RNA sequence: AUGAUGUCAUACUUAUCCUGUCCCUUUUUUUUCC
C-alpha cells in the first residue's frame, strides 16, 4: 500500500490535472483506512465532486491500477472562488501600493438585468451631456435654474392589480410582480410564471385565500418544476422588506414542495440554502427548528454527494459568517445521513494542509455535530477524537480555541461513558492549562469541566486538585465569558463527590459570594439561571444553613431582580435539602425576609409565591 | 412535521407536563391508565430530564398507557417521544 | 414466537455483568447488570446489535476476566441466497462465525 | 413496517409471501417444545439433528427463487 | 341557542316556497330529480332554484313522453 | 389463454373478465377457490363510489329490537316556545321519564343476523334470500289460498319454467311446509 | 369583517324572505341571512 | 365530595346553566366541567339528565357537541347503562342526521368507558350498527365503525365473536376509499377485530385481495394483511392454506403431513 | 344514468387547535496592567 502513497502522489498528479484542491484529494484516498473494502461507492461521490465525465475516467483507471498493484505484491464553481479572493488581493494590494459604488462593464451590465431590455443612445449629443453631465453637475448646479408654475384648467393612468380580486400589492412587491399587472391574456413557460403568481396569494390575502393557494400550488410541484418556482420564489424570501409571517409562509411553501421533489432539485440545492443559512442563526427559536428541519429534508431529499459536492467552496470563503451558518449547515445534513457516511470526508477536511480557515471551519462542525445530535454522538466518540485532536497543536490559535471547545460539546453529550477515547486528548490539555492567557484558556477550563465527571475519582482527584488552584485564582477576571465558564466549573467540579467539604467552605466560598454575587450578573439572563444551579450544588455539598445564611440579608436588597434571584435560590435549596438543618435565628431572619420581599412586587411571576 | 422517534425503549419512565399529564400518548384519551411509559435515554437526557414527552415543559407527573392499545400491543415498540421533524 | 423477536437464544457472561439476549434473526439485543448500592441486582437499558438478514444458530458467553465482554454469534447470510436465481448461493454459502465485543465505556455493541 | 420483516407490499411475489410463511412456520417450529417433539418422533432423529436440518432449510426453502 | 333556531326557520321557509325536494333518512335535502344532495335546504333550493336543475326535469320530462 | 386457462381449477367459474390479466393467475385461480375464504366485494368496476340514494330513499329510519319495545320508553320520548324554555329553566321539572329500573334491570338480562358465509354489497336487500316457489304473505291473501299456490297446478301441465330451469315446486317433481312451495 | 361578496345562496333566500315578509321590514330578513346586514340586504335588494 | 347539603332543585339549574358552558376554547375547562356533569349524574341519577344531553341542537360541529356525547357516556357509566340505553337508542330514530351520528359517538365513548360489561349490550346495539353502518352518509360507517372497534376490544375473550363476525360482514364493504378519517377508522375497526375474533376468520376474508389484478385493491388487501400480519404473526401459522407446488419450486410444507 | 376541468358555494371531520415557549446564534484581526 505503500504504492497507494506514490500511488497517492500519482492521484495527485492525475487529479491536479483533470490545481491544487487539497480536499477532494484526501476525499479519494479517505477510502483507504477501509482497505479491501472500498468498492463503485467511490465512484458515486466523487461523481458529483469533480465533473461527472471525468468521473468515469479516473474511478476506472483507479481501479484497474489498485487491483493490479494488489495481485504483484462545480469545479467553476471552484474557479470562481478562486478568482474572487484574487480580486481580493488585487484591490485589498492596490491600496498598499497606493465598494459596491466600484465603476462596471457591459458584461457585468448584462449581468444583473434580466433578459428583454434594450440599451439606448438616444443621441451620441444627450450621451456626450451624460458625460459633461459630472462636470456640469458642479458646473450647471452652479448656475441659473428655478421651477414655476401657472394658473390654468385642465388621462390618468395607473394600476392596482385587477382581474377579479387579486389581493392587494404592497408599493414594493410591485417590482416583484408587475408582470400579474398587465391584462394581456391568453396568447407556455411565460403562462407558467405568470399563473404562478399565486404565490402573491399566499404571501398577501385572507387566510383562505393563502389555504387553497397553498393546497394548489402543493398538486403542481410535479407540474411545474423546481426551476420555475425558486425562480420566482427566492427573490421574495430575499427580499429586504420580508416581514415575519412572509418568510414563515415562504418557508412553508418549500416544505411542502420539498416533500415531493426529489432527484429535481438537484442544481438548485445551494440556491436554496443559501437563503435558508440564515434561518440557522436567529433570535427566533421557532425559525431555527424549522430551519434545521428544511435543511434535513433538502439534504435527505437531494443526495450526499450532492450536499457535500455542493457545499465545499464555501469552506474557504472570506466571510466567516458563511463558514458558520455552513458549518451548522453540515451538523443537519450529517443528522439527517448519518455521521459514519459523512466521517471521510470530515476525517479529510481536519488534515487540509491548505489554509487554517477550512480547518476552524470543519471543526466547528464537528462541534455543532456534537450539540445537534448531542447524545446519539456515542457510537463514532471515538474516530471523532481522533479526528479532532491534531489541532489542539496547531500553530493557530483559533483551531486550537475552537478544538477544545469542540471536545467540550462531546464529553458533554457524552455525559458519562467513553472516557478513555477522550483519553490522548488530556495530558496536552492539563499542560496548556497551565500556561494560557486569555479566552482560549477558559475554553480549556470548558473542556476539562465537562470531562472531570467522566474520571474516576482517585485519578480525577489529583487531576482535580490541580485544577482548583487555577480556578480560584481565576474568579476575579472581569470577562463574562469567563465567569460563565468558571461557573459552570465550580459546578462540576465541586460538586464531584470524591471533594471534601471544609475546603470548599474554607477556599471557596468567600470568594465565590463576593466576585460572583453582584449586579452585575442577575441583569443577564444565562449568567442568572447558571449562577443559581452553581449555587444549588454548593448547597447540595456543604449544606444548607451556610449558603442560605449568607444569602439571606440580601432578600431585602432594593432591586428586583436580584431579590427574584436569591428567592429562587433559596427556593431550590429548601426544595432539596430540606428546612431541618435551619437554626432558629436565621429562620427569623428568613421569614421576614420571603414576607419583606413579598411585599413589594413590580411584576407579577410565580417565582416568590412558589418560593 | 411531527413523529415518533421509535428509538430503543429503554428503562427510562415517561414524564408529563400539566398539559399532557392525563393523555395515554398513542389512543390521545384519558381513559384506564394501566401500564407504564419507557423511553430511551437518547431520547430522555439533560434539559430532558423530566421533560414533556411532548411540548417540551417540565414533566409533573408519569404517563400510563390504556388498556386499548395494551391488547393490541403497540406499548412494545419503540421510544414514543415524538420529535418534530 | 416470532422470526424477529428475542428470547430464542440466551447468554451470559462469566462474571455476570451483561447477559445478552437474541432471536433466530435480525435481532440481538445485551440488558447489562450491576448490583445497585446495597448490592441488589440494578438492570441497565438496552443495546442494540442489529445485522440485517442474519440467521442466528447459537449465541454463547465468552470468558474474558474483567474486560470488555465477548459473544460468540453463530451467524449465516441469505441474502446470498435470495439473490441467486441460479442456485449456487445455496451451496458455497460458510455459516459466519463473528464475535461481537460490548464495550462498557463506549456503551454500544460493535461486530 | 419496512424494518419490519415479512412486510407485504402490492407488488409481492408468490415466491417471496411463500418463504416468509415457511421460514416463519420453521421459527414457530424452533419456538414451541412440542410440535418440535412431535416431528422428532414422527421421523425418527434427535431434537438437534431435527433443528439443525431447519436451520439448513431456513434460506433454501422451494428451492432457488424465479 | 341562537343558531339552532337560524337552522329551523330556513328549513320552512324553504318548506314555503317550496314537487322535488325532499329529505332523505338522515337529515339532508335532496332533488330526485338531480340526484343532489344539499347541505341546508336553502342552499340546495338555490340549486333547485337553479337552471340546470330546471333543465334535466325537462329532458327527464321529454324522455318520460316519449 | 383465458380460455385454457378455465381447465387447470377445480371450479373455474372463479376466474372472471380481468382475471387474466392477473401477475399471478396460476395462483390467485388456486386461491379465490380456497375453501372457506370470502369473495371480493363488487363495487369497483363500477365508477359510482360504491352508493346512490335510489333504494336508500325507501327505507325506515329505524325500528328497536322487541325486547326494547316491550319496555315502554317508546312513548315516553315524544313543541316550547323561547320563553317556556327559559321557564323550563326559572320552573323546572323533575321526573318526566320516570322510569323502573326494575324493568331497566329485568328486560336486558330476564329477557335478554348471519353466518360467516355471506357479506354485504351495495344493492343487495331482499332478494337473494321473492322467488319461484317463494312469495309473501299479503299476495297470498289476495290469491286466498288456505295453508300448492294453484297456479303450480298448470306447472304441472305446460312445463318448467324456461326462465328458472333449476326449478323445483313442491308435489312435482320437489317432494313444502308454510308459505314457502317451491327451491 | 361582515362585508363580503354576494352568494346565489343568500340571494335566493333573499327573494323568497322579501316575497313573505314585505319590503319595509329590514331587521327581520337580515336576522335569516349570516354575515349581512339589514342595510346591506335592502340596498341589494333595490 | 359533599353534595347532600344543596336541594335538587339547584342542582338542576346547575345542569341547565352548565350546557352552554361546553363553549368553552379551552379543554380543562370542558373536562372539568363533564366530570362535574357526571358527579351530579350521580347526585340526582340518569333519566332527567341524560334527557337534557339529548336536548342538544347540535348545532356547531365539534367546539363541542361531541362532549355532551362524552357526557352522555359518564353518566351512562355513573349509574348503570343497564338502565339507560333504550330512551338513547330510541333517540337515533330522529330524522336529524347529526345528532343520529351523535349517538353513534355516545355507543363509541360508551363501550370505551364501560370495558368487559358490554358482553350483554352488544346484542342490543348489532342491529343499531347494522342500520347505521349501512351508509346513509360516510360518517355513519365511520363513527359505527369506531363503536365496532371498541366494542371489540372491549368484549375480548367472553365469547360473543359471533355477532362481532355478523356485523363484520356489513363493516367490510367500507375497505375502499379515500377518506382519510373513515379509512383510519375503518382500519383501527379492523384491528380491534382482529383480536376479538381471532386472525383466521380475518385472513379468510383478506386471502383473495392480496393477488388480485388491481392495482387498488393489491395496495389494500396487503395494507390490511400486514395490520393482521405484524401482531399476532405467532398464530398465523395455521392458517396459510395449502398452495401446490410449481416447477422450480416446493410450495407443500409436509412438516404438517407427518402422522404418526 | 356521477368523466375531466374550474379558486362558486355550503355542510362536515379530527375530545386536533388557542397557551404555551426564550437555555446553549454569541461568529473577528490571541490579548486586562506588581
Ligand atoms: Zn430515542
Ligand atoms: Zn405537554
Ligand atoms: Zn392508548
Ligand atoms: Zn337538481
Known amino acids: 500500500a505503500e504504492k497507494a502513497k506514490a500511488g497517492e502522489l500519482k492521484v495527485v498528479n492525475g487529479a491536479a490535472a483533470s490545481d491544487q484542491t487539497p480536499g477532494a484529494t484526501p476525499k479519494k484516498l479517505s477510502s483507504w483506512d477501509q482497505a479491501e473494502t472500498p468498492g463503485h461507492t467511490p465512484s458515486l461521490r466523487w461523481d458529483e465532486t469533480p465533473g461527472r465525465a471525468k468521473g468515469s475516467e479516473t474511478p476506472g483507471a483507479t481501479p484497474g491500477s489498485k487491483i493490479w498493484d494488489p495481485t504483484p505484491s462545480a469545479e467553476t464553481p471552484r474557479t470562481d472562488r478562486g478568482g474572487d479572493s484574487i480580486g481580493e488581493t488585487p484591490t485589498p494590494g492596490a491600496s498598499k501600493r497606493k465598494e459596491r459604488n466600484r465603476p462596471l462593464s457591459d458584461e457585468e451590465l448584462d449581468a444583473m438585468f434580466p433578459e428583454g431590455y434594450k440599451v439606448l443612445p438616444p443621441p451620441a449629443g444627450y450621451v456626450p451631456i451624460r458625460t459633461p453631465a459630472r462636470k456640469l453637475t458642479a458646473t450647471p448646479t452652479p448656475l441659473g435654474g428655478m421651477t414655476g408654475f401657472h394658473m390654468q384648467t385642465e388621462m390618468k393612468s395607473v394600476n392596482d392589480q385587477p382581474s377579479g380580486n387579486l389581493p392587494f400589492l404592497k408599493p414594493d412587491d410591485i417590482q416583484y410582480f408587475d408582470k400579474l399587472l398587465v391584462d394581456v391574456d391568453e396568447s407556455e413557460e411565460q403562462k407558467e410564471r405568470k399563473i404562478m403568481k399565486l404565490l402573491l396569494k399566499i404571501k398577501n390575502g385572507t387566510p383562505p385565500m393563502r389555504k387553497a393557494a397553498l393546497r394548489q400550488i402543493t398538486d403542481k410541484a410535479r407540474e411545474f418544476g423546481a426551476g420555475p418556482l425558486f425562480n420566482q420564489i427566492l427573490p421574495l424570501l430575499m427580499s429586504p422588506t420580508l416581514e415575519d409571517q412572509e418568510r414563515h409562509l415562504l418557508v412553508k411553501v418549500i416544505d411542502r414542495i420539498l416533500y415531493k421533489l426529489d432527484d429535481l432539485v438537484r442544481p438548485y440545492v445551494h440556491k436554496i440554502l443559501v437563503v435558508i443559512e440564515p434561518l440557522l442563526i436567529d433570535e427566533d427559536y421557532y425559525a431555527r427548528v424549522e430551519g434545521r428541519e428544511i435543511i434535513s429534508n433538502l439534504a435527505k431529499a437531494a443526495g450526499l454527494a450532492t450536499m457535500i459536492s455542493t457545499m465545499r467552496p464555501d469552506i474557504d470563503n472570506m466571510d466567516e459568517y458563511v463558514r458558520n451558518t455552513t458549518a451548522r449547515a453540515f451538523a443537519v445534513v450529517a443528522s439527517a445521513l448519518g455521521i459514519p457516511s459523512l466521517l471521510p470526508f470530515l476525517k479529510a477536511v481536519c488534515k487540509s494542509k491548505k489554509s487554517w480557515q477550512a480547518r476552524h471551519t470543519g471543526i466547528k462542525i464537528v462541534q455543532q455535530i456534537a450539540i445537534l445530535m448531542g447524545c446519539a454522538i456515542l457510537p463514532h466518540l471515538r474516530s471523532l477524537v481522533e479526528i479532532i485532536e491534531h489541532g489542539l497543536v496547531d500553530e493557530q490559535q483559533k483551531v486550537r480555541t475552537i478544538s477544545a471547545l469542540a471536545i467540550a460539546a462531546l464529553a458533554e453529550a457524552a455525559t458519562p461513558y467513553g472516557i478513555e477515547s477522550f483519553d490522548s486528548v488530556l495530558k496536552p490539555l492539563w499542560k496548556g492549562i497551565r500556561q494560557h492567557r486569555g479566552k482560549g484558556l477558559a475554553a480549556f477550563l470548558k473542556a476539562i469541566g465537562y470531562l472531570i465527571p467522566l474520571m474516576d475519582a482517585e485519578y480525577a482527584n489529583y487531576y482535580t486538585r490541580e485544577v482548583m488552584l487555577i480556578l480560584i485564582r481565576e474568579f476575579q477576571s472581569p470577562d463574562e465569558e469567563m465567569k460563565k465558564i468558571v461557573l459552570k466549573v465550580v459546578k462540576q467540579c465541586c460538586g464531584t463527590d470524591g471533594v471534601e467539604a471544609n475546603y470548599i467552605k474554607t477556599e471557596i466560598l468567600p470568594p465565590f459570594f463576593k466576585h460572583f454575587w453582584q449586579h452585575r450578573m442577575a441583569l443577564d439572563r444565562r449568567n442568572y439561571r447558571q449562577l443559581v444551579d452553581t449555587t444549588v450544588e454548593l448547597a447540595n455539598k456543604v449544606g444548607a444553613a451556610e449558603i442560605i445564611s449568607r444569602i439571606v440579608d440580601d432578600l431585602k436588597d432594593e432591586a428586583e431582580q436580584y431579590r427574584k434571584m436569591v428567592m429562587e435560590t433559596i427556593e431550590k435549596i429548601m426544595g432539596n435539602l430540606g428546612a431541618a438543618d435551619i437554626d432558629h435565628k436565621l429562620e427569623e431572619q428568613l421569614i421576614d425576609g420571603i414576607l419583606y420581599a413579598f411585599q413589594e412586587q413590580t411584576t407579577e411571576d410565580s417565582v416568590m409565591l412558589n418560593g | ?85 | 414466537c416470532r422470526r424477529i423477536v428475542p428470547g430464542q437464544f440466551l447468554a451470559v457472561d462469566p462474571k455476570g455483568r451483561a447477559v445478552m439476549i437474541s432471536a433466530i434473526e435480525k435481532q440481538k439485543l445485551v440488558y447489562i447488570l450491576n448490583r445497585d448500592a446495597a448490592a441488589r441486582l440494578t438492570i441497565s437499558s438496552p443495546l442494540e446489535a442489529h445485522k440485517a438478514n442474519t440467521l442466528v444458530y447459537h449465541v454463547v458467553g465468552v470468558d474474558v476476566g474483567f474486560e470488555n465482554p465477548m459473544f460468540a454469534c453463530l451467524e449465516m447470510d441469505y441474502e446470498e441466497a435470495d439473490n441467486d436465481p441460479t442456485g449456487e448461493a445455496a451451496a458455497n454459502t460458510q455459516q459466519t462465525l463473528t464475535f461481537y465485543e460490548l464495550d462498557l465505556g463506549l456503551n454500544h455493541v460493535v461486530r | 413496517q419496512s424494518k419490519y420483516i415479512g412486510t407485504g407490499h402490492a407488488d409481492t411475489t408468490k415466491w417471496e409471501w411463500l418463504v416468509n410463511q415457511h421460514r416463519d412456520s420453521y421459527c414457530s417450529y424452533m419456538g414451541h417444545f412440542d410440535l418440535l417433539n412431535y416431528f422428532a418422533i414422527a421421523e425418527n432423529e434427535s431434537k438437534a439433528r431435527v433443528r439443525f436440518n431447519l436451520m439448513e432449510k431456513m434460506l433454501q426453502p422451494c428451492g432457488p427463487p424465479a | 341557542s341562537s343558531s339552532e333556531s337560524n337552522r329551523d326557520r330556513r328549513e320552512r321557509l324553504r318548506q314555503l316556497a317550496l314537487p322535488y325536494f325532499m329529505k332523505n333518512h338522515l337529515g339532508s335535502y335532496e332533488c330526485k330529480l338531480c340526484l343532489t344532495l344539499h347541505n341546508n335546504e336553502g342552499s340546495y333550493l338555490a340549486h333547485t332554484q337553479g337552471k340546470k336543475h330546471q333543465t334535466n326535469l325537462a329532458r327527464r320530462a321529454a324522455k318520460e313522453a316519449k | 389463454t383465458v380460455a385454457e386457462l378455465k381447465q387447470l381449477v377445480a371450479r373455474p367459474d372463479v376466474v372472471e373478465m380481468h382475471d387474466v390479466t392477473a401477475q399471478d393467475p396460476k395462483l390467485l385461480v388456486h386461491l379465490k377457490a380456497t375453501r372457506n375464504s370470502v369473495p371480493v366485494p363488487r363495487h369497483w368496476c363500477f365508477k359510482r363510489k360504491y352508493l346512490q340514494g335510489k333504494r336508500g330513499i325507501e327505507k325506515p329510519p329505524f325500528e328497536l329490537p322487541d325486547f326494547i319495545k316491550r319496555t315502554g320508553i317508546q312513548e315516553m320520548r315524544e313543541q316550547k316556545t323561547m320563553k317556556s324554555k327559559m321557564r323550563e329553566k326559572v320552573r323546572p321539572k323533575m321526573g318526566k321519564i320516570d322510569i323502573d329500573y326494575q324493568k331497566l334491570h329485568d328486560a336486558f338480562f330476564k329477557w335478554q343476523l348471519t353466518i360467516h358465509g355471506d357479506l354485504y354489497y351495495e344493492g343487495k336487500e331482499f332478494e337473494t334470500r321473492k322467488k319461484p316457489g317463494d312469495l309473501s304473505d299479503e299476495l297470498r291473501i289476495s290469491l286466498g289460498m288456505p295453508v300448492p299456490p294453484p297456479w303450480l297446478i298448470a306447472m304441472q301441465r305446460y312445463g318448467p319454467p324456461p326462465s328458472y330451469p333449476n326449478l323445483k315446486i313442491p308435489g312435482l317433481n320437489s317432494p313444502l311446509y308454510g308459505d314457502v312451495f317451491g327451491t | 369583517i361582515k362585508g363580503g361578496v354576494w352568494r346565489n345562496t343568500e340571494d335566493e333566500i333573499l327573494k323568497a324572505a322579501v316575497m313573505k315578509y314585505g319590503k319595509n321590514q329590514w331587521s327581520r330578513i337580515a336576522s335569516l341571512l349570516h354575515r349581512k346586514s339589514a342595510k346591506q340586504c335592502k340596498a341589494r335588494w333595490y | 365530595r359533599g353534595a347532600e347539603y344543596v336541594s335538587a332543585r339547584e342542582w338542576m339549574r346547575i345542569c341547565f346553566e352548565l350546557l352552554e358552558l361546553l363553549k368553552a376554547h379551552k379543554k380543562a375547562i370542558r373536562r372539568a366541567t363533564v366530570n362535574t356533569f357526571g358527579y351530579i349524574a350521580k347526585a340526582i341519577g340518569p333519566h332527567d339528565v341524560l334527557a337534557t344531553l339529548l336536548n342538544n341542537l347540535k348545532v356547531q360541529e365539534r367546539q363541542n357537541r361531541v362532549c355532551t356525547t362524552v357526557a352522555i357516556a359518564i353518566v351512562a357509566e355513573t349509574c348503570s347503562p343497564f338502565t339507560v340505553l333504550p330512551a338513547l337508542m330510541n333517540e337515533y330514530r330522529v330524522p336529524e342526521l347529526n345528532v343520529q351520528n351523535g349517538v353513534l359517538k355516545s355507543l363509541s365513548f360508551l363501550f370505551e368507558y364501560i370495558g368487559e360489561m358490554g358482553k350483554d349490550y352488544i346484542y342490543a346495539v348489532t342491529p343499531l350498527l347494522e342500520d347505521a353502518l349501512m351508509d346513509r352518509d360516510l360518517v355513519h360507517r365511520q363513527t359505527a365503525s369506531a363503536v365496532v372497534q371498541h366494542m371489540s376490544l372491549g368484549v375480548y375473550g367472553f365469547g360473543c365473536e359471533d355477532s362481532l363476525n355478523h356485523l363484520l360482514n356489513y363493516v367490510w364493504p367500507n375497505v375502499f376509499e379515500t377518506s382519510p378519517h373513515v379509512i383510519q377508522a375503518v382500519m383501527g375497526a379492523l384491528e380491534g377485530l382482529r383480536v376479538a375474533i381471532g386472525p383466521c376468520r380475518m385472513l379468510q376474508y383478506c386471502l383473495q385481495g392480496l393477488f388480485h389484478p388491481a392495482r387498488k385493491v393489491r395496495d389494500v388487501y396487503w395494507k390490511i394483511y400486514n395490520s393482521i400480519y405484524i401482531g399476532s404473526q405467532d398464530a398465523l401459522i395455521a392458517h396459510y392454506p395449502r398452495i401446490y407446488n410449481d416447477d422450480k419450486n416446493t410450495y407443500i410444507r409436509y412438516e404438517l403431513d407427518y402422522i404418526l
Open chain 2, 1 to 85: 412535521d411531527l413523529i415518533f422517534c421509535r428509538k430503543q425503549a429503554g428503562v427510562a419512565i415517561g414524564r408529563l407536563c400539566e398539559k399532557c399529564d392525563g393523555k395515554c400518548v398513542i389512543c390521545d384519551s384519558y381513559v384506564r391508565p394501566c401500564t407504564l411509559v419507557r423511553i430511551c435515554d437518547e431520547c430522555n437526557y439533560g434539559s430532558y430530564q423530566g421533560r414533556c414527552v411532548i411540548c417540551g415543559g417540565p414533566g409533573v407527573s408519569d404517563a400510563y398507557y390504556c388498556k386499548e392499545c395494551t391488547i393490541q400491543e403497540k406499548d412494545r415498540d419503540g421510544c414514543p417521544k415524538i420529535v418534530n421533524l
